Amino acid sequence: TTIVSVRRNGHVVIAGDGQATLGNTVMKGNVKKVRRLYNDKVIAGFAGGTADAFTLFELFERKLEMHQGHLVKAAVELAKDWRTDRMLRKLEALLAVADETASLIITGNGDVVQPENDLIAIGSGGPYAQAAARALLENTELSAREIAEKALDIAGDICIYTNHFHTIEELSYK
Amino acid sequence: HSEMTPREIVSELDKHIIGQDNAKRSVAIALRNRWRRMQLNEELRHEVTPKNILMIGPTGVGKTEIARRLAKLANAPFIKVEATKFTEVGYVGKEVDSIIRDLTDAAVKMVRVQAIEKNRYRAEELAEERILDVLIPPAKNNWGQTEQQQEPSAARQAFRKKLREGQLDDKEIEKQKARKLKIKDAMKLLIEEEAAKLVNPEELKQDAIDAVEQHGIVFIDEIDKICKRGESSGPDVSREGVQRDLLPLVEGCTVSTKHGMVKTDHILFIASGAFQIAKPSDLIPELQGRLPIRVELQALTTSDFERILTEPNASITVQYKALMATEGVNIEFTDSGIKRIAEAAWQVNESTENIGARRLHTVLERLMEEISYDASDLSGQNITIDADYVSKHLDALVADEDLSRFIL
């Protein structure tokens, strides 16, 4: 899979492909890997179980309800339980989350990570996307959305575990 | 507690009692003194004791009324004991400590009821949220905008606006409850449910005590009936016994109440007597000392009677009008009608036994017996009790003496 997040000109995005793989064959080709949270204010993408999601995203929402929209903190408070609670522990995934404030990755390890330029690229196709995103972001005036898109395609072209079905969630603010 | 001046007290007392100005001032000085005490220093606060009063006067002329309104006016615990109630304890009977107990069981039956007043808005505000929580089960962990749990006050505003009478819709809530029920009950089950949490123990029962000790008012009726009379001797020591028994109470002591230890050192005592047989100087020495204030009340006159009928707030006449209104009937008293009701009451009291203003309630009440009954089948009328009506209904009765001893 490949999750790509970018941020340029008061615009942030998260884009993902839709391939789920089992062994050497495709199980499904249209998996929704990018949703929306906290009353459609917070966007997110993810790599993992469809349930792990509908559990880690529900929780994340409540963590925001416990920290007035403040992304980061709810994010910190999130990765917190995710590494402690006996049960929540077995959950496996890689959440990419971003609000108008900032964007960041969360791993079952409990880490909260803010990448160089709010640029995120997780998943087996992650680096190829990063390489292409970085290239574009540094040599062209293209938009955050246009980036993630083009970057995602580049990925799906190189990564045997990434396809060309997309799911993007933008955000405007300025 | 009240910061009312004596003059203001008397004024306030004038709204319920006709005449007896002197007794009013005496009782008014007493109240103000309780205030005067707290404005003093450590020492002087122990030393200064209540100036207990000895009201002297004939039956039903306003003695208890005055003391009852005085108490009521200072939201003070009030008890009225009949002195002879203990004259039979030389054989068996109630101990005088009972007075301080009752003044306590009532100083509680008071602090409690007046906790249902203060806590009558709490259960129907920060407690009606119960039914609204099962009507629209709040967000899974409300967010937080100090106006977010107030935002609904749209969906939420509807369930509350419609909760202005519309109920009988069975639901359930939460030993919390859990049990399934209705609303003519789920709601009322909540009335007391959420209320017993605001009122605590060691402050309520502790305060009833603080009340009695600081604002208690004991009215010892017929204190003159426990004085020495020159007819015998054995019964006298029995009487004087009640005087010695009461002595600790007005001299300063500690009584045991099932709510705590009450100290009588600052309870105000209003003793009362007719003093036709005995004189206040027949009271034992120690008691005369503790009864520094002596005030007489005059017998009521026909004019006092006319005024008592209509002047006081919620006078019997006013009450009657009110009660007949309940039946949709408009009752009205002309000046001469009242002049005659009073006149009648005076007559019976002179021709038979004098019972003071009491007589007015019985005369007034016999006079109205007919309208009181027929009131329901007279709705929408203007009945006028005038001199004529009065005479037709009372004359015969008042005229016949033996009959007056029975019927009036």
Ligand SMILES: Nc1ncnc2c1ncn2[C@@H]1O[C@H](COP(=O)(O)OP(=O)(O)O)[C@@H](O)[C@H]1O
């Ligand atoms: N001066 C008065 N003013 C108003 N009501 C009075 C007066 N005197 C007597 N009454 C009425 O008569 C009844 C007699 O009782 P009370 O007034 O306590 O006097 P007492 O203690 O001398 O018997 C009371 O219910 C009261 O309403």
